[PDB]
């Protein structure tokens, strides 16, 4: 049996840590909901 526990509010944090890049990728989405790279 799965259960839920509160973890916090949903709020934008001013001066949060900024990271991660912005890749533009060609992808396919199958019937099972799996994404894959198209080349």
């Amino acid at each position: 049996d799965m259960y839920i526990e509160r973890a916090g509010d949903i709020t934008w944090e001013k001066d949060a840590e900024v990271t991660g890049n912005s890749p533009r990728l060609d992808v396919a989405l199958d019937e099972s909901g799996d994404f894959s790279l198209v080349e």
Binding site: D1, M2, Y3, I4, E5, R6, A7, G8, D9, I10, T11, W12, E13, A16, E17, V18, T19, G20, N21, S22, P23, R24, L25, D26, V27, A28, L29, E31, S32, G33, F35, S36, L37
Partner: protein
């Protein structure tokens, strides 16, 4: 059960100890998560029961107690925040400029942030605090790093 709006951890006691299998958003009395987190199973909130109401394996989304309520969208220009809720760790906001997943049916935002599997369902927010999608369904690129789609449902 606790119906207060916010981000919640999705836990199980079937495996060893208490394991976090994912995360979700409670908004307007509806709990929203990714399909692969619960496989559509019922959820518990204290003594109360949450029954699935809508779901779709291809979109990889599911809602409990009511229809999908989240309808905000990434504007295609601005930075966003992943409100990551990792297993055994405190909720933490990470700011990023999304990339793009280009498909034969249109484009979708994507966030290049790597977290444990049990972080699936963590909300991605805009500058107004509105949930523009959930983190946790994506792809592994050449360098072995993870890139998640910004997955948003439709509000009927």
């Amino acid at each position: 059960g606790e119906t207060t709006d916010g981000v919640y951890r999705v836990m199980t006691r079937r495996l060893l100890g208490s394991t976090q299998v994912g995360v979700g958003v409670m908004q307007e009395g509806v709990f929203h998560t990714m399909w692969h987190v619960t496989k559509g199973a019922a959820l518990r909130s204290g003594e109360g029961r949450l029954d699935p109401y809508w779901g779709d394996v291809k979109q990889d989304l599911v809602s409990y107690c009511g229809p999908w309520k989240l309808d905000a969208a990434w504007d295609g220009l601005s930075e966003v925040q992943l409100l990551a809720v990792p297993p055994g760790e405190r909720a933490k906001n990470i700011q990023t400029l999304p990339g793009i997943f280009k498909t034969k049916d249109g484009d979708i935002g994507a966030v290049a942030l790597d977290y444990p599997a049990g972080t699936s369902g963590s909300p991605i927010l805009d500058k107004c605090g509105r949930v523009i999608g959930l983190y946790g369904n994506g792809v592994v690129i050449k360098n072995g790093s993870y890139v998640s789609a910004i997955t948003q449902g439709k509000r009927e």
